[PDB]
Design a protein around this ligand. Sequence first.
Ligand SMILES: Nc1nc(=O)c2ncc(C(=O)NCC(=O)NCC(=O)O)nc2[nH]1
Length: 263
Amino acid sequence: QYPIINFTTAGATVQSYTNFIRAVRGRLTTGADVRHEIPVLPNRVGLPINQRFILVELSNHAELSVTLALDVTNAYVVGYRAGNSAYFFHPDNQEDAEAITHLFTDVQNRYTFAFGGNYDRLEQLAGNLRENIELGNGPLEEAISALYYYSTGGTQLPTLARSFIICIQMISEAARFQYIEGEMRTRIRYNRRSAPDPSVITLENSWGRLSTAIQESNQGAFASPIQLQRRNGSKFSVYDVSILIPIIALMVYRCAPPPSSQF
Ligand SMILES: Nc1nc(=O)c2ncc(C(=O)NCC(=O)NCC(=O)O)nc2[nH]1
């Protein structure tokens, strides 16, 4: 019943990847909520369970496939299926726990990790930070195999977590930020994997605050500037939503949009 978007790393190109990310964004947002030309994800409050998740089916050159479940309210990867087993991150709360029971209902083995799925926790388990984990088509091809072999003991916990960190950034973060999609395009185009630089990391870390700053802005102007980093790690101040239009594709829902007057 939940929509499925397919992607394969086998023979992937900039175009096939772009088609994928565009389709993901299309299933995450409804078009009911756009502010400053930037789409907002569905409000969690009052969202019917039948509209809560989307599924991303990943296949690779090794002919393996796994299916990620994303929460439409935040684009968060909440768990995955590989064959006869499903694995879910430790839910943040009771309502989320009930919600995930609606996923992969006929899977014969259901597990809930004892740990959550945030970067901080995954980086601890992986023994590596995002800044030291290479991204690109190769890493994603490898991540898909790693997730597929987890149930049989073939994949060590550190490698599982590393693989999650790769999937989340190449799918969820790419969907959230055209900038990050663009970074992954580059790596795919030249088939050259590489770790995310500070421009990627700071955007990832700031998504929630950027969403709030935009939605709370006065006609687009931030009350308090947000500091990001450029590629070389130097500071870049954001004062206004305008500079983010080419950069951020989707925001998390924070406030209802105030009334909009025409002077
Ligand atoms: N599983 C998972 N899916 C995601 O899309 C995701 N996307 C982002 C993060 C993440 O830690 N972001 C930074 C952070 O501090 N998050 C918590 C917050 O500030 O609200 N973690 C994720 N984990």
